[PDB]
Amino acid sequence: GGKWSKSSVVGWPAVRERMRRAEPAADGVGAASRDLEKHGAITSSNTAANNAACAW
Numbered sequence: 001g002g003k004w005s006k007s008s009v010v011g012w013p014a015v016r017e018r019m020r021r022a023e024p025a026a027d028g029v030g031a032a033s034r035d036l037e038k039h040g041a042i043t044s045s046n047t048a049a050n051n052a053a054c055a056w
Contacts, residue, residue, distance in 0.1 A: 031038030044053055 016050055032041055044056055046055060
């Protein structure tokens with residue numbers, strides 16, 4: 001199926017440090033309904049202008 005001879009390079013194991021344990025919290029909130037809904041609940045659409053997102 002072709003797609004032969006291919007490889008990648010460089011990496012960034014920064015999250016590996018904070019992701020090692022997780023987050024020591026007592027009865028808090030992980031997301032809104034399940035998990036993705038917390039981040040999925042974000043609607044930002046700007047026309048033209050500059051620097052999308054990070055606004056409203």
